[PDB]
């Protein structure tokens, strides 16, 4: 049920492309292009997902002003309204709000360093039933806001970018704290 620090997850999101329906996942390639690109996975039985780059690890999670101290300097469950440090499964660049554009709001992409605001992302649930400081749960919808640009992570129509507009983002688990030994899927 509960998402945690070092719980690998993909950032999937809904998109009714072609008169519904195209579920699709955020997935920066890492080494070669810092910019993220959307990775549709609805096909399942058809074309297989490029899930290997889809993944992200939650290396840290903090209160929004808990953030605002270490920057001026335990697998804890994610709480709603905490800022969280996303991190790529492959290149292991942390995800961030890149200071670039493609036509106001910034492009999203990986960054080499955990440092510097943009890498952090506050979690704002869309549902009112959830509340700030509640434990985040599997497959729950939630907005992701950049701490730096103060822009929502967004499904621009299609490519991801930070934007003033919001978009829902499923935190679908890939894995939790898998036992030592014992093969799991997604391993090379």
């Amino acid at each position: 049920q509960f998402l945690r620090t070092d719980d690998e997850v993909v950032l999937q999101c809904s998109a009714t492309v072609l008169k519904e329906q195209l579920k699709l996942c955020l997935a920066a390639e890492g080494f070669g292009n810092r910019l993220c690109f959307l990775e549709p996975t609805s096909n399942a039985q058809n074309v297989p997902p490029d899930l290997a780059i889809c993944c992200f690890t939650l290396e840290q999670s903090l209160s929004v002003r808990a953030l605002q101290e270490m920057l001026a300097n335990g697998h804890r469950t994610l709480l709603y309204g905490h800022a969280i440090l996303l991190r790529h499964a492959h290149s292991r660049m942390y995800l961030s709000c890149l200071t670039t554009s493609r036509k106001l709001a910034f492009d999203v992409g990986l960054q080499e360093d955990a440092t510097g605001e943009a890498c952090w992302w506050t979690m704002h649930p869309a549902s009112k039933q959830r509340s700030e400081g509640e434990k985040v749960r599997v497959g729950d919808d939630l907005i992701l806001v950049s701490v730096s640009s103060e822009r929502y992570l967004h499904l621009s129509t299609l490519q991801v970018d930070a934007s003033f507009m919001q978009t829902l983002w499923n935190m679908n688990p890939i894995c939790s704290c898998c036992e030592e030994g014992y093969v799991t899927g997604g391993h090379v």
């Binding site: 605002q68 200071t99 106001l104 709001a105 910034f106 605001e117 730096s148 640009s149 103060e150």
Partner: protein, 96 residues
């Protein structure tokens, strides 16, 4: 009519009055991104306020060669001769 431009002026002025809080400056640089508004408002010589907002914004939110590029207050200096008038009042607003 020009009141929409007075709204954009009021807006860029209100954002011209905003400067932890270092990031918000990036939030405002995100909207210089100005520059052309001072030139278009000088070419439209109404005038004093719209540009005054752009200039207050350019001062607060924002290198000497770039300052050389912003030369145009000479236009307003030509406007000073126009007193010999509503446009005269404008020049005053420019001296500030």
């Amino acid at each position: 009519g020009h009141a929409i431009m007075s709204f954009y002026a009021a807006l860029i002025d209100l954002l011209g009055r905003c400067a932890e809080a270092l990031r918000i400056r990036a939030i405002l640089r995100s909207l210089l991104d100005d520059l052309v508004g001072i030139i278009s408002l000088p070419l439209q010589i109404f005038v004093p306020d719209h540009k005054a907002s752009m200039v207050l914004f350019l001062d607060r939110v924002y290198n000497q060669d770039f300052l050389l590029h912003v030369l145009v207050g000479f236009l307003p200096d030509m406007r000073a001769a126009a007193s010999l008038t509503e446009m005269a009042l404008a020049l005053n607003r420019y001296l500030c």
